[PDB]
Design an enzyme around this catalytic site. Structure first.
Site, PDB file in Angstrom:
ATOM      1  N   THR A  30      36.811  29.456  40.999  1.00 38.63           N
ATOM      2  CA  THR A  30      35.506  29.443  41.645  1.00 38.63           C
ATOM      3  C   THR A  30      34.494  29.973  40.607  1.00 38.63           C
ATOM      4  O   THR A  30      34.791  30.929  39.889  1.00 38.63           O
ATOM      5  CB  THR A  30      35.538  30.370  42.878  1.00 38.63           C
ATOM      6  N   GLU A  63      44.344  28.604  32.756  1.00 40.25           N
ATOM      7  CA  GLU A  63      43.285  28.089  31.899  1.00 40.25           C
ATOM      8  C   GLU A  63      43.727  28.156  30.446  1.00 40.25           C
ATOM      9  O   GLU A  63      43.219  27.399  29.598  1.00 40.25           O
ATOM     10  CB  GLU A  63      41.999  28.888  32.049  1.00 40.25           C
ATOM     11  N   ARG A 113      30.049  32.953  35.482  1.00 42.83           N
ATOM     12  CA  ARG A 113      30.413  33.888  36.532  1.00 42.83           C
ATOM     13  C   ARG A 113      30.803  35.236  35.936  1.00 42.83           C
ATOM     14  O   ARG A 113      31.337  35.302  34.836  1.00 42.83           O
ATOM     15  CB  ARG A 113      31.583  33.304  37.340  1.00 42.83           C
ATOM     16  N   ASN A 995      43.312  30.420  48.591  1.00 38.56           N
ATOM     17  CA  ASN A 995      41.998  31.003  48.457  1.00 38.56           C
ATOM     18  C   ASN A 995      40.942  30.145  47.796  1.00 38.56           C
ATOM     19  O   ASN A 995      39.794  30.113  48.232  1.00 38.56           O
ATOM     20  CB  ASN A 995      42.091  32.319  47.698  1.00 38.56           C
TER      21      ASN A 995
HETATM   22  C1  LIG Z   1      42.724  33.793  35.026  1.00 38.24           C
HETATM   23  C2  LIG Z   1      42.292  33.269  36.362  1.00 38.24           C
HETATM   24  N1  LIG Z   1      42.238  31.904  36.692  1.00 38.24           N
HETATM   25  C3  LIG Z   1      41.806  31.498  37.979  1.00 38.24           C
HETATM   26  C4  LIG Z   1      41.398  32.389  38.965  1.00 38.24           C
HETATM   27  C5  LIG Z   1      40.987  31.917  40.303  1.00 38.24           C
HETATM   28  N2  LIG Z   1      42.026  32.362  41.299  1.00 38.24           N
HETATM   29  C6  LIG Z   1      42.969  31.532  41.774  1.00 38.24           C
HETATM   30  C7  LIG Z   1      43.294  30.034  41.224  1.00 38.24           C
HETATM   31  C8  LIG Z   1      43.677  32.253  42.798  1.00 38.24           C
HETATM   32  C9  LIG Z   1      44.422  31.243  43.820  1.00 38.24           C
HETATM   33  C10 LIG Z   1      45.532  31.935  44.413  1.00 38.24           C
HETATM   34  O1  LIG Z   1      46.722  31.315  44.672  1.00 38.24           O
HETATM   35  P1  LIG Z   1      48.025  31.851  45.329  1.00 38.24           P
HETATM   36  O2  LIG Z   1      48.860  30.729  45.760  1.00 38.24           O
HETATM   37  O3  LIG Z   1      48.564  32.781  44.362  1.00 38.24           O
HETATM   38  O4  LIG Z   1      47.497  32.697  46.456  1.00 38.24           O
HETATM   39  P2  LIG Z   1      46.918  32.321  47.926  1.00 38.24           P
HETATM   40  O5  LIG Z   1      47.418  30.917  48.164  1.00 38.24           O
HETATM   41  O6  LIG Z   1      47.307  33.322  48.863  1.00 38.24           O
HETATM   42  O7  LIG Z   1      45.321  32.399  47.787  1.00 38.24           O
HETATM   43  S1  LIG Z   1      42.359  33.039  43.803  1.00 38.24           S
HETATM   44  C11 LIG Z   1      41.399  33.314  42.446  1.00 38.24           C
HETATM   45  C12 LIG Z   1      39.414  33.940  42.620  1.00 38.24           C
HETATM   46  C13 LIG Z   1      39.077  35.038  43.822  1.00 38.24           C
HETATM   47  O8  LIG Z   1      39.068  34.487  41.162  1.00 38.24           O
HETATM   48  C14 LIG Z   1      38.400  32.511  42.992  1.00 38.24           C
HETATM   49  O9  LIG Z   1      38.104  31.838  41.991  1.00 38.24           O
HETATM   50  O10 LIG Z   1      38.273  32.002  44.402  1.00 38.24           O
HETATM   51  C15 LIG Z   1      41.443  33.774  38.554  1.00 38.24           C
HETATM   52  N3  LIG Z   1      41.087  34.825  39.311  1.00 38.24           N
HETATM   53  N4  LIG Z   1      41.907  34.123  37.263  1.00 38.24           N
END
Ligand SMILES: Cc1ncc(CN2[C@@H](C)[C@H](CCOP(=O)(O)OP(=O)(O)O)S[C@@H]2[C@@](C)(O)C(=O)O)c(N)n1
Ligand SMILES: Cc1ncc(CN2[C@H](C)[C@H](CCOP(=O)(O)OP(=O)(O)O)S[C@@H]2[C@@](C)(O)C(=O)O)c(N)n1
Ligand code: SF4
Ligand code: SF4
Ligand code: SF4
Ligand SMILES: [Ca+2]
Ligand SMILES: [Mg+2]
Ligand SMILES: [Mg+2]
EC number: 1.2.7.1
Lengths: 1231, 235, 118, 117, 58
Positions: A30, A63, A113, A995
């Site tokens: 995001t 990434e 961001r 998320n």
């Molecule tokens: C290095 C890195 N790459 C990408 C992100 C963006 N993030 C993600 C792709 C995480 C997705 C989570 O997946 P999973 O399966 O582990 O958990 P769940 O399904 O319970 O959510 S939420 C999060 C954040 C808050 O910053 C955003 O970009 O929304 C991050 N924080 N850090």
């Protein structure tokens, strides 16, 4: 040619990126996620790029993975792009040096961001892009949606011709998610601007075995410096190339740009230098103030790198005497932020007139940068001239903030209509605003702008829409603060939020409510609002959107009615054209299932237009009696910090209100009591069998079992109905299931699984339950929790423990929180939680709401979110700390055993030492030491007494989603588990990145539909469990609450007690899976997941092998043939069937085949007689030895890399052959 | 007491880092490898730090893992250190923002080495340390084998008392591998310079279920900015 | 025209063989997450791991590929955990070709594996 | 492709300094650890032998399908598939849906029946 | 007539301490950076020093 459209910065730039790239390696983050997802959607729809091909897009594991892939693609001769931000951009930094170092035409599109420091923020600022200013990438900033489009194109064209990679960036949310009517170019126009000679050169210099070269050499001091400077010519030419493409693109669009552009008084004395969306707002303010005679100006930074001082000065008025540089970032300890330093450098090198230069910081984490703040900045330059100031906050700690006068006049162009809509989660308000923007923009010459504020709450959250329509370009990159039209779509908001704030005099206020009668209105409308409506002569309208929707057949669905209200009263369009356009569009959209669904909507419109009459009110409202204040009791922190934030006043909290390190106290969610469930459960004690399954399953801890003695129920309300407790160990106790109606989210899981045919729990409207239950929960809450009656880890007994994670912001019926809540009931008082970024960190700790709390003794989970990629290593670190500090304690203890410490103290120490790693014994003896050493302040016994928070054995847990465990953090997870240390990993598998918006992860199953797997994932689900089991020494287990709560509890106890690494993977339901009958069926879905054989349950326990038995045990039975209905009951599978029935059938059959094979493999694992066996430890022994000691031949090389302080001795370097060959040669050479 | 010894920059630094740390999460990368290897051998030989304890050192899967472990150990109240350079330091950057952001007394000893661009190089320059200048870590340079020892000590002492992590750096090879006859201090002397109250305070505010807090929240535009400026008094 | 463009793409005529070379430190540790993801992708690539059972270049530090009891830097009293089974881990996918070789034992099995993997 | 351990492992290890130096410095632990390595490989080979004897293995699908087109996982879902978060916000999001705050389809329908009116 | 200012604490960069080491007689000052930030108007140390002189206003 051209083409008009209303879209956001993300889409505007993805539009260009797709056209100009052949390959894209991506990862979701995001607020850049939208670009990758659109690119994927377009590639699947058949959209061609300038080469007439669909884009080749692939999702990587992180990434960092995406960046390496981008580098490979470019090195291999393909135009490549990626979309990223914040944490993700940081992971790309290493590859950026390589991509620029190798002069590759890559383009990174970044939604700027904030970086996670004291806290994580998904919002907008430049901390991320400045972190990469030294990578050698050119940096082009766009400050508006229209610019994102234009700059994205310049970036690609310039990257191709210059051979220098580009980073095109625009502000997160403020530009990426703002909607504007803009103009975009055709792909053929973009294609025509491409330098063909350069493109061919790129192709020809790329990696290829037909004409290979070596790239990425290792260089010594003799030539490295020269090699680094050899690209100089390329960086000297990029500026001119950017300028030429700005001009070439301009000749096609009519929009001109310079590396640095100037706006404002040609004879300005006070000038601001800024970058990004702030530039638009600053300009809007300049027009306003300059028209009044103020000599002010602004220099807009387009090309930030290379920084061309000549182009900067070409934009600087000679008459400027005070210059303020605005940086949207913070570099602690630096003498000044980036842009400021660059400007200062320009002036010193110029070596002439030195106007006063000031540095200002703004907009961190999308903090508002409003017109009044620009006024502050200009006033500062003619006033105090404070340097290194901040604006947008009140810094009452270091006093760096500029005061801001919010009475500043509205500066939007003449004729701009501004609107604000207050909506409730999923009531369709936002969707109708986006539709209204499309309708109005496609049918008028008006410019339109839309921006949306959401809630940290995932369910029942409040949304606020800010829309602007005007005859002049809308440069307002800040929220609406003086609206002409204000609409409140949720009557509940009326009393709690300042909804009419700043509304213009004579403005229109539309309200959705059933308070049609003046007496009803007078009864609900707060005094403050009445006075406001009165004193401002507001055009107040009330409309029972819910009654009209019901009557026309739309069933309480209000979107169409409120939509009509806007088109009729906002005044951006004439009535006739409006109702006309609105109707035409209803036929456009919908028009699906018969004309009946079209009729209800059309009818709803007419009914709305009719019933939409001006509510008349008495002049007596001018001074309605200012109500009292029936505010309940809470704590100082909730009163002074969280309440203000929850009521949207956080912006007013000064810096003095926060902890320097960003920490928050536990339990602030105890007082939110949102009351947003539509229906809540009602206990029917006559049918209750007293099982505690309802409390066990609640995703929000909204059910409170009560076990009181007669005495504890004396002052109990009359309706506090309690049964005499069932069970031998509960003889004499009164049992009650207390429903917490205000914290309930109304999902229905409890009621859904309540055992008795004649349900003991029935869903009922919140209003029919709150009056009785609110005072009831309140009373029950004060009844001691009977944690000592039944076994803590027994189904029933666990619900008699204090839950240490409650009322989180997770979605109603969330499949992750039930598991966590129970885990805390078992170990909460002694756990450390290293939580991976994801839904669990978001519902787990979105300020200011903190669901984790302490028990009655003040003990609770010590919770922390480091990053997304390092959760395991983070928890492993906490474990290292405990090892080191508790080893220190052990040493002090043994030491004190050899002193004149008292017999009691020694007994206790000896006891603690023996039970050091046992939760029961370490606490037993630690608690004795706390008593025995109370007060002791000197010597050895004094140090021991000061380490009491280390006495009882702690439980380190690592919480994370599947995206974390199977993808980005897999390497970390793998290493930590391989360490053999005592940590516990709890993976909440949602089979997607929840998320961030449902993106596919390696945990996504075959055929499931998710982002980047929109035709159904074509690879099976990665087998994390079986991969970890190959170690043999890691406890591995799978669980599914809905299938067996007992097995879940058994797993928790076994995993945690295992003295080594433990991995527990849980099936977590999630709204992204699209459960057909609602999330209230999660438990049942979890049940089926296991019965179908889709999610088999098992446990791999290494200690059984240590005692000769098979470590692997199956806990579920062979597939029962129900997988098909299991899949078809979830949209993530059903959508595929409806869209690609042929492939969907195939994929569902493949899934059935996969699970059938997998189960058979598990069955054999459980039948095996051959298994990895080994002891817990044994060895250590003080001492070390180098692998080279006494070796017969050299064991290290002649390299600078192996040189060590003690290296350098002579040795046989294997240039004379084998020991035998040398011997034989010696005999042969006898002589 | 003072002790005259002939060693290189890595050793002179490692000499101090070992004494002042309880925990170390490491990853190998030239030219800083010597430091972590020395720390590991010393711990295995039973060398005591200023707390009379042998160091708790673990090798991670990469520097990112090493930095996340360092962050966790510090958050849990253990004085922690790590050794790195170049590509490794880049991998630690995400955690560096968090460590400084949470005002943790971490100390990174870095042998400044070139970043791989048109080519990789294991040799010395400040490309890497400059890439981390916005992380919020204080950065203290040593220009000789003798200063490497002295600044290393200052960095630890100052990080403990200030709550701002420190990055002690010196030139890869040119200082890290140069041998010089210098003076080093006894561990006892280093221990007597420690701010005992700051240290106790660091342990009392650390993560512990006995007196929990939440760290690493997610914050909206209403409070993020204020929250980021709150650490000014420390810097 | 078309034939001119095709003529200019001759270095793409022949099917290419994409290889990824790396040591055990890379494959078992630092690059494991990426190696894992790339193999799971199902694309046509060939990974050749030269397992020296230590990070060799940097000075013999232990890696997860280092066997029980082997002495190396950070395993100065013999590594106390066994070698990570990267091979069996990757075989769990079912769609990845996995093989182990040892030239001194069989040059023919080595050549057979190259041909089969590629 | 190879055969069961031939028992030469002890000589194999002891012929390498990475193992022998341990033998000379910590003879007792080394002895244990070399026996542990011998046990480890004994078991592993046995596991590989079963793998070779099993008749349980999954099919192999190279590629094929794609079906020009794609669909969003929320398309035509009975309840909301996305939250009220700015993280899930997308260009085409915003349309009203059942956010699961009223209970199951079945529970909702029954409440309707029970409150017929 | 030459001198050298040795930078010990690079971050936080304290200008007061920088000037406490600068001779009043200094007419020309060369800032040496051991790095290269392509496209930047100057390397890190140079930029920090420039800012010091600009803010001093003398
Ligand atoms: C290095 C890195 N790459 C990408 C992100 C963006 N993030 C993600 C792709 C995480 C997705 C989570 O997946 P999973 O399966 O582990 O958990 P769940 O399904 O319970 O959510 S939420 C999060 C954040 C808050 O910053 C955003 O970009 O929304 C991050 N924080 N850090
Ligand atoms: C991010 C990061 N961490 C650490 C290093 C240091 N590097 C390593 C640890 C490499 C050793 C690799 O071991 P393995 O097992 O994969 O291969 P092999 O045994 O064949 O050597 S050589 C190398 C380098 C050249 O830069 C250095 O520091 O010396 C690096 N380049 N990047
Ligand atoms: S309906 Fe859902 S949130 Fe409400 S008490 Fe039941 S399980 Fe909990
Ligand atoms: S699930 Fe039903 S029967 Fe069981 S304790 Fe709850 S209300 Fe009673
Ligand atoms: S895991 Fe799914 S259901 Fe739970 S909070 Fe996240 S999006 Fe909502
Ligand atoms: Ca465990
Ligand atoms: Mg997930
Ligand atoms: Mg190796």
């Amino acid at each position: 040619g051209k083409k008009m459209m209303t879209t956001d910065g993300n889409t505007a730039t993805a539009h260009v990126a797709y056209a100009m790239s052949e390959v894209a390696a991506i990862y979701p983050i995001t607020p850049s996620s939208t670009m990758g997802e659109e690119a994927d959607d377009w590639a699947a729809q058949g959209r061609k790029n300038i080469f007439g091909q669909t884009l080749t897009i692939r999702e990587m594991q992180s990434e960092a993975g995406a960046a390496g892939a981008v580098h490979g693609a470019l090195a291999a001769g393909a135009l490549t792009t990626t979309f990223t931000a914040s944490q993700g951009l940081l992971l790309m930094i290493p590859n950026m040096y390589k991509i620029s170092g190798e002069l590759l035409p890559g383009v990174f599109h970044v939604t700027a961001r904030a970086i996670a420091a004291h806290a994580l923020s998904i919002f907008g600022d430049h901390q991320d892009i400045y972190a990469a200013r030294q990578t050698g990438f050119a940096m082009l900033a766009s400050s508006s949606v229209q610019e994102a489009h234009d700059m994205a194109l310049v970036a690609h064209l310039a990257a191709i011709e210059s051979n220098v990679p580009f980073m095109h960036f625009f502000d997160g949310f403020r530009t990426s998610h703002e909607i504007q009517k803009i103009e975009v170019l055709d792909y053929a126009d973009m294609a025509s601007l491409v330098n063909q000679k350069a493109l061919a050169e790129f192709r020809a210099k790329s990696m290829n075995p037909e004409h290979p070269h070596v790239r990425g050499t290792a260089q010594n001091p003799d030539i490295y410096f020269q090699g680094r400077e050899a690209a100089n010519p390329y960086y000297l030419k990029v500026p001119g190339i950017v300028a030429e493409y700005m001009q070439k693109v301009a000749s096609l669009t009519g929009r001109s740009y310079k590396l640095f552009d100037y706006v404002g008084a040609p004879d300005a004395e006070r000038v601001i230098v800024s970058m990004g969306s702030s530039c638009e707002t600053i300009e809007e303010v300049i027009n306003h103030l300059a028209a009044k005679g103020e000599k002010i100006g602004l220099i807009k930074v387009r090309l930030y790198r290379p920084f061309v001082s000549e182009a900067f000065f070409a934009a600087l008025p000679a008459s400027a005497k005070v210059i303020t540089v605005l940086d949207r970032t913070k570099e602690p300890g630096a003498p000044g932020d980036p842009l400021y330093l660059d400007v200062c450098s320009a002036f010193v090198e110029r070596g002439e007139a030195m106007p006063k230069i000031l540095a200002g910081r703004y907009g961190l984490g999308s903090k508002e940068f409003s017109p009044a703040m620009v006024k502050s900045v200009y006033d500062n330059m003619s006033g105090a001239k404070k340097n290194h100031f901040t604006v947008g906050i009140e810094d009452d700690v270091t006093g760096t903030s500029l005061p801001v006068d919010n009475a500043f006049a509205d500066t939007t162009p003449k004729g701009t209509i501004q609107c604000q809509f207050w909506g409730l989660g999923a009531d369709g308000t936002v969707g109708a605003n986006k539709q209204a923007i499309k309708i109005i923009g496609d049918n008028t010459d008006l410019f339109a702008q839309g921006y949306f504020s959401y809630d940290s709450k995932k369910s029942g959250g409040i949304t606020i829409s800010h829309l602007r329509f005007g005859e002049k370009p809308i440069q307002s990159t800040y929220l609406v603060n003086r609206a002409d039209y204000v609409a409140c779509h949720n009557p509940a908001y009326v009393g709690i939020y300042d909804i009419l704030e700043g509304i213009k005099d004579g403005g229109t206020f539309v309200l959705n409510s059933p308070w049609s009668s003046l007496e009803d209105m007078d009864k609900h409308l707060p005094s403050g609002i009445k006075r406001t409506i009165a004193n401002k002569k507001l055009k107040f309208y009330n409309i029972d959107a819910v009654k009209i929707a019901t009557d026309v057949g739309l069933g309480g669905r209000i979107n169409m009615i409120m939509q009509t209200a806007f088109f009729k009263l906002a005044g951006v369009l004439p009535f006739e054209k409006a109702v006309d356009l609105l109707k035409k569009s209803i036929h456009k959209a919908y028009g699906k299932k018969g004309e009946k669904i079209v009729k209800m909507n059309t009818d709803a419109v007419d009914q709305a237009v009719t019933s939409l009459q001006e509510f008349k009110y008495p002049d007596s409202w001018k001074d309605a009696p200012a109500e009292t204040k029936a505010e309940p009791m809470t704590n100082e922190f909730f009163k002074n910090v969280v309440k203000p934030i929850l009521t949207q006043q956080g912006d007013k909290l000064p810096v003095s209100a926060f902890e320097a390190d960003g920490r928050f106290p536990l339990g602030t969610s105890q007082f939110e009591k949102r009351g947003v469930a539509i229906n809540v459960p009602q206990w029917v004690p006559e049918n209750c069998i007293q099982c505690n399954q309802c409390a066990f399953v609640c995703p929000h801890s909204a059910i409170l079992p009560v076990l009181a003695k007669e005495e504890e129920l004396v002052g109990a309300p009359a309706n506090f109905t309690a049964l005499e407790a069932k069970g031998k160990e509960l003889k004499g106790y009164k049992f009650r299931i207390q429903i917490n109606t205000l914290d309930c989210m109304g999902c229905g899981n409890c009621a859904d699984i309540c055992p008795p045919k004649e349900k003991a729990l029935v869903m009922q409207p919140l209003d029919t339950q709150r009056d009785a239950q609110v005072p009831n929960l309140e009373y029950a809450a004060r009844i001691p929790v009977k944690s000592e009656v039944l076994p803590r880890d027994s189904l029933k007994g666990s619900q008699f423990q204090e839950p240490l994670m409650e009322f989180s912001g997770a979605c109603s019926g969330c499949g992750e929180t039930p598991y966590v809540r129970v885990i805390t009931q078992l170990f909460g008082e002694r756990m450390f939680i290293a939580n991976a970024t994801g839904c669990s960190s978001i519902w787990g700790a979105s300020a200011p709401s903190m669901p984790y709390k302490t028990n009655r003794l003040g003990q609770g989970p010590a919770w922390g979110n480091s990053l997304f990629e390092d959760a395991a290593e983070y928890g492993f670190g906490m474990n290292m700390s405990m090892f080191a500090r508790r080893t220190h304690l052990a040493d002090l203890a043994a030491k004190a055993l050899e002193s004149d410490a008292s017999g009691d103290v020694k007994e206790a120490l000896q006891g603690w030492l023996a039970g050091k790693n046992d939760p029961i014994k370490s606490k037993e003896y630690g608690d004795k030491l706390k008593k025995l050493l109370a007060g002791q302040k000197d010597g050895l016994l004094g140090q021991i007494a000061a380490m009491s928070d280390l006495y009882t054995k702690k439980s380190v847990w690592i919480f994370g989603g599947d995206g974390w465990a199977y993808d980005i953090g897999y390497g970390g997870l793998d290493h930590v588990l391989a360490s053999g240390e005592d940590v516990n990993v709890f993976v909440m598998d949602t089979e997607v990145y929840s998320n961030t918006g449902g993106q596919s992860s390696k945990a996504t199953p075959t055929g499931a539909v998710a982002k980047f797997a929109a035709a159904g994932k074509r690879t099976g689900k990665k087998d994390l469990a079986r991969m970890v089991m190959t170690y043999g020494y890691v406890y591995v287990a799978t669980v599914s609450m809905g299938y067996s709560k007992q097995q879940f509890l058994k797993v928790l106890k076994e995993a945690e007690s295992f003295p080594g690494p433990s991995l527990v993977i849980a099936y977590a339901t999630c709204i992204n899976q699209g459960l057909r009958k609602g999330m209230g069926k999660s438990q049942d879905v979890m049940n089926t997941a296991v019965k179908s054989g889709y999610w088999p349950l098992f446990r791999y326990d290494p200690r059984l092998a240590a005692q000769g038995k098979n470590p692997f045990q199956l806990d579920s039975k062979a597939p029962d043939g129900s997988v098909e209905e299991f899949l078809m009951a979830q949209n993530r599978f059903a959508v595929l069937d409806r869209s690609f029935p042929e492939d969907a059938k195939r994929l569902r059959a493949q899934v059935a085949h996969e699970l059938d094979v997998r189960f058979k493999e598990l069955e054999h694992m459980a039948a095996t007689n051959i298994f990895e066996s080994f002891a817990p430890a044994g060895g250590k022994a003080d001492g070390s030895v180098d692998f080279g000691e006494g070796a017969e031949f050299c064991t290290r090389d002649d390299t600078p890399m192996m040189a060590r302080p003690d290296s350098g001795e002579a040795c046989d370097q294997n240039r004379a052959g084998t020991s035998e060959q040398q011997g034989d040669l010696s005999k042969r050479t006898k002589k």
